[PDB]
Design an enzyme around this catalytic site. Structure first.
Site, PDB file in Angstrom:
ATOM      1  N   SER A   1       0.614  -0.856   0.175  1.00 58.59           N
ATOM      2  CA  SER A   1      -0.136  -0.330  -0.026  1.00 58.59           C
ATOM      3  C   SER A   1       0.621   1.446  -0.295  1.00 58.59           C
ATOM      4  CB  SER A   1      -0.719   0.282   1.225  1.00 58.59           C
ATOM      5  OG  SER A   1      -1.386  -1.156   1.446  1.00 58.59           O
TER       6      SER A   1
ATOM      7  N   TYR B   1      -1.554 -11.000   3.876  1.00 59.07           N
ATOM      8  CA  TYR B   1      -1.664  -9.878   4.067  1.00 59.07           C
ATOM      9  C   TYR B   1      -3.076  -9.751   4.609  1.00 59.07           C
ATOM     10  CZ  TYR B   1      -0.741  -4.376   3.606  1.00 59.07           C
ATOM     11  OH  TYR B   1      -0.367  -3.242   4.131  1.00 59.07           O
TER      12      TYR B   1
ATOM     13  N   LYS C   1       1.608 -10.762   8.169  1.00 52.04           N
ATOM     14  CA  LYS C   1       1.224  -9.021   8.383  1.00 52.04           C
ATOM     15  C   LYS C   1      -0.343  -9.025   9.059  1.00 52.04           C
ATOM     16  CE  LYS C   1       2.160  -4.111   7.331  1.00 52.04           C
ATOM     17  NZ  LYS C   1       1.743  -3.241   5.907  1.00 52.04           N
TER      18      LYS C   1
ATOM     19  N   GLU D   1       1.013   2.746  15.443  1.00 48.99           N
ATOM     20  CA  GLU D   1       0.948   3.353  16.611  1.00 48.99           C
ATOM     21  C   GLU D   1      -0.238   2.840  17.769  1.00 48.99           C
ATOM     22  OE1 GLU D   1      -0.292   3.720  13.482  1.00 48.99           O
ATOM     23  OE2 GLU D   1      -2.406   3.396  13.370  1.00 48.99           O
TER      24      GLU D   1
ATOM     25  N   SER E   1       4.858   2.102   7.536  1.00 51.34           N
ATOM     26  CA  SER E   1       5.841   3.471   6.745  1.00 51.34           C
ATOM     27  C   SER E   1       6.551   3.979   7.069  1.00 51.34           C
ATOM     28  CB  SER E   1       4.529   3.954   6.057  1.00 51.34           C
ATOM     29  OG  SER E   1       3.434   4.185   6.985  1.00 51.34           O
TER      30      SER E   1
END
Lengths: 296, 295, 294, 293
Positions: C45, C135, C163, C190, C206
C-alpha cells in the site's frame, strides 16, 4: 375486517406535561386526532412512544388509556417488547386484558443474544399474549440486531406470529419476504420509502409521521391500487419534504411540535436526554402545521 | 434517443479456456443485447471484470464493442481506475472510439478526501474531451460512503451528465431526484428496479439485463402505463432469477446461462473467481431454456 | 536465518511528472539500511502499488534488489486483485532474488474464502520457493476474516508469515497462541509496543522510513524489561503519527524525507493531492528533530 | 483514589429469576477475600438492563452494606433515561458509594450535546460523587470521537473513564491528553496491552474468578517482568476464549457456582442456560482456579 391487521397504522407518540409526566388529555386528543384522519389503527408503546425511557407501569398506563379511547374503532397493536423477557410477558398479559388486537416486540437489544435466544424470547411473549397475534419487529438501525433472511423466515413462521414490522430500507429483502410468505402481514417501517416499499411487497405500514399526515399514506395506497403512479410519487415526494425537516429538527419532538400547533399536544417535549427543538426550526414547523391543517 | 436515459446492460467480458478475451463471443453478446431491444451498453465496469483486466485489455474491449454497436445503441465507457492517470487514458480512448459517454467509480482502497474525489472526476472529464461523465456510486464494492451533499456536488460538476446509483437506499434515490429534476439517474441494483424507478430513477444499468433485458423494459413500460401489477410480477420473476445467480456466483452464473443460449463459448470468469459448482448446471440450463422460450 | 524483525514499508518516490524517481528510490533504500532496519516490504500500500502498472511495480522490485539484496531482508508484495497478475509479480520477485512474497486479500469484488485460499496457493506456486506472507488489512481491503479463516491461511503450504494490520490485540494473542513459531508482523505503527506484548514478534510499517530506530528501540526495551522506555518511545512515535495522519500519511512521510535530503520531489500520484502548505513548518521541524535525534 | 483493578460484579438470581441476596453477599465477600481493589456495580455484567430501577437500587444497597469502607465502590447508574439515571445516582450517594458511572444512553440516537447534558444532570444528582464516563461502543452502538471523549472527561465532576474499546491507539491518545486521568481498561483479553498503551487499571467481569491474575499483570509490568505479564495474559485469554464460547455471564456464574459462591448459575431471560457440553470444562476450570489461589 374484524381480525385483519393489514393497513396503515400510526406509531403513537406519548405527550408529556411540563414536568415530563404523561399528559393524559393530550394523549386522548392524539388518539382521536388519528382516528379522525382515517387511520386504520395504532401501534402503541414502541420506539415512537418513548417506551424505552418509560417504566413498565407508565407503559401500561398508556396502553390502558388508548384502549379506552380507541378499542373497537380502529385496530390496536401493543408493543410490549423490553430487553427482559419477563417484563415483556407482563406487558403482553396487560395488552390482552385491555383488549388489544395484537402484540409486538422489538428484538431484545444491548446484550448480544443468540438467534435461539431471540426465538425463545418471542415464544415466551406469544405464550403470555394468550391468543393475540405477535408482530415481529425488525429494526437493525436502532436495535443493533442484524438478522439474515433465513432467520427472519424462521421468526415469522413461529406459531402465533401474524405479522412483521419491517423497519429496513432493503427492498430486495422486502420482496424476498413477500415471495416466501404470500399471506404474511408486512408493514413498511421507513415512511420515506413507503411507496417503493408497497411496490416491493409490503401490504401496509407503521410510521410515526402518520400522526400528522396519515391521509397522505392512505392516499399512496389508493393511488397505487388504482394505477396512478404520478399521484403516488407526488404524495411520497411531499411526505419526504416533511421527513427531511423532521430529521433535522429531531423526529419525535418535531412531530410533537407540529401537533402542538395543530392544537392536539399541549406541551411538545420529549423526555431527557432528548433536548428541545432548536428555535431556528419553529418557522418551518409552524408553517407545516398550517399547511397540513389546510390540506386536511 | 437524444439523451442517455434508458435501460443499459452492464456488459460481461467473455473469455476462452485460457482466460484470454474471446472476441467472437464478445461480438455475439453485443449483438445479442441489441436484439433484446436494450437501449445501450455500459462497458468496462465491475461486470466486465475490468478490475482483473489490464488497461490495454479494457481498451481492447472498448474498441470491439464500438465496432459492433456504435450508432446502433448508446455506449457508455467505464474508464474508472484507482489511478487518475490510468482513468484518463481510458477516457481518451473512449473518445477516440466514439463512445457516447464515460463513467468512473469513486477511486477505492486508499482513503481519499472528497476534494480529491472531485479533482479525480474533473481530470477524467478533461481527458474525455466532450463526452459527458456518469458518476458511479457503489459503496458496497468501493467502500466509499458519500453523503447526499457530496453526491449533489459530484453530479453538478462541470461535464457530469448522469449518476449510476448502485445503492439500495431509496430515500436517497428520491432525494437525488428531488434536487436534480433533469438528471439522468440509473438504478444500479436490478433486484429493486421497479421500486427504484418509483423512487425517482429514470432508467437503469444492470448485469442481469444480458439475459433478460426485455423484462426490465417491460417494467418501465408497465409503470408508464400505470400497470402496477404487471410491474410487480415482472420484478418478482427477475428476483427469482437473481436469487439463483447470487447463489451460483453472479458473473459466472450469467455467463453460463449465456453459454446455454449459444452466445458465450466458455463461461469462465478470471481468477480469483472460481468455476460454477456443477450442482447448479441443471437449474442454470433450465433457466436458459425458460428465457429463450419466453422470447 | 528467518524473516522476523522490523521492516520498513517502502515508499515510491516520484518526480514532478508522477514518474518513478530512480535516484530518490535508491537514496531511500540506502537511508533505511543506515537506520539499522532489518528489511524492506516493497510494492505494498505504502509504495502506491495500486496506482502503478505491473511493469512499474516490477521496475521498483528490480531496483530495490540491486540496492539491498544480501544486505537486509526483502519482501515483495506482489498482490493484485487478479491472481494471474499477482503470479507475474511473484515470478519476477523470485527472479530478482527477494527473500519472500506477500499478497493482500484480493479486494473490490466479493470472493469466497475458498477463492481466497486458491488465490494464495496460485501465487505461492509462481513464487517458486519464496515463502508467502499473508496480508490481513480489513480497513483498506474490506475483507473481514474470522480467526478460523486466518488460521487456515497461515497454515497453507508455503506460507511463512502474517502481516497483521489489525488493531485487535485479542486476535493478535490468539494467533500467537495457535501458532507459536509463526512470524507475526504488527501492522499498525501506533500500537507497535502493545502489539509486540500481545504476541507479534516484529512489524512492518510506513513510518519506519523516518524513525525506524525508534521501533528498534522499543523491541530492545521490551526485550530488556524496560517498560517505561518502551512506552516513552511509543508515545513519541504516536505524536508523529498524529501529525502524519493530519497531513496525509504517504505525502507527509515523503515531505519529511524531502527535508532530510532523501526524496527530491515529495509528491504522491493522483488522486492523492499535495500536502497543505500550512503543515510544512511542522513537517520541516520534525525532519530537523529526527535528524538531530539520530 | 479510584485507580486500580476492580471487578464488574455479577447479580446472582434464584431458580425463579429473583435476586439471590445470600449469593450476592457471598460474591462480594469472595471478591474482597481475593484482594480486589473495588467493585463496579450495576453495569452490563450485573444484568442491570434486564432489571428494574428498584431492583438495581436493592443490589447497590446490599453491596454497600457488605463492602463500604473495605474496598472502593463504583455504582453504575446509567439508563437510557436521564431521570432514571439521576434517581440511581441519588441512591448511590445515600448508600455511600465512592463514585457513580453511566454508559452513554443508547437505542435512540442522541446528539453529542445531549450526551453531555445527560452526564451533567447525573453528576448534579450524584451530589459530590465523581463520575466515571463509560465508553462501550460494541454494546451501546454509540461511537465517540477522540475530541468528544476529551470533552466528556473534562466535564466538571468527571474523575475517570472506563474504556471498553480495543483501540489502543485511542487509549494512548487519551493518556497523552490527560496525564492524570484514571483510565480503566475494559476488555480483559487485552489488559496487559491496554496498560502498556496508557490505562492505569481496569474493570472486568472475569476479575470475579481470577482477579489476582490481573493484579499479577500490573505487578509484573511494574517490575519489568514482561515474560510473566504475557504468560498471565495468555492464561487469562485461554479462560476468556471458553467463557465467550459458553456465554460470558452465565459461564462466570457457573464457575462461581462450582466454587460454592453462587447458588444458582442462571442469568435472566432472554439469556439461556449453559449448554451442558461445556460443563466438563467449566468444572475443571473451577477446580483449577480454586487450587491456584
Amino acid at each position: 375486517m374484524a381480525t385483519n391487521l393489514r393497513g396503515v397504522m400510526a406509531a403513537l407518540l406519548t405527550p408529556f406535561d411540563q414536568q415530563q409526566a404523561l399528559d393524559k388529555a393530550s394523549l386522548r386528543r392524539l388518539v382521536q386526532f388519528n382516528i379522525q384522519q382515517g387511520i386504520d389503527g395504532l401501534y402503541v408503546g414502541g420506539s415512537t412512544g418513548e417506551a424505552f425511557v418509560q417504566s413498565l407501569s407508565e407503559r401500561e398506563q398508556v396502553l390502558e388509556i388508548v384502549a379506552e379511547e380507541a378499542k373497537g374503532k380502529i385496530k390496536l397493536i401493543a408493543h410490549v417488547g423490553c430487553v427482559s423477557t419477563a417484563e415483556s410477558q407482563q406487558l403482553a398479559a396487560s395488552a390482552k386484558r385491555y383488549g388489544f388486537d395484537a402484540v409486538s416486540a422489538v428484538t431484545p437489544f444491548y446484550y448480544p443474544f443468540s438467534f435461539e435466544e431471540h426465538c425463545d424470547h418471542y415464544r415466551a411473549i406469544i405464550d403470555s399474549a394468550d391468543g393475540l397475534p405477535m408482530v415481529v419487529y425488525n429494526i437493525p438501525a436502532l436495535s443493533g440486531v442484524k438478522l439474515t433472511l433465513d432467520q427472519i423466515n424462521t421468526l415469522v413462521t413461529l406459531p402465533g406470529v401474524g405479522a412483521l414490522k419491517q423497519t429496513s430500507g432493503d427492498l430486495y429483502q422486502m420482496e424476498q419476504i413477500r415471495r416466501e410468505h404470500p399471506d404474511l402481514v408486512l408493514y413498511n417501517g421507513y415512511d420515506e420509502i413507503f411507496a417503493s416499499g408497497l411496490l416491493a411487497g409490503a401490504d401496509g405500514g407503521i410510521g410515526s409521521t402518520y400522526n400528522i399526515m396519515g391521509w397522505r399514506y392512505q392516499g399512496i395506497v389508493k393511488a397505487l391500487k388504482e394505477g396512478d403512479i404520478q399521484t403516488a410519487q407526488k404524495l411520497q415526494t411531499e411526505c419526504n419534504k416533511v421527513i427531511d425537516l423532521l430529521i433535522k429538527t429531531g423526529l419525535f419532538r418535531g412531530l410533537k411540535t407540529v401537533l402542538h400547533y395543530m392544537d392536539v399536544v399541549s406541551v411538545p417535549l420529549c423526555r431527557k436526554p432528548f433536548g428541545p427543538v432548536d428555535e431556528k426550526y419553529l418557522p418551518e414547523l409552524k408553517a407545516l402545521a398550517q399547511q397540513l391543517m389546510q390540506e386536511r
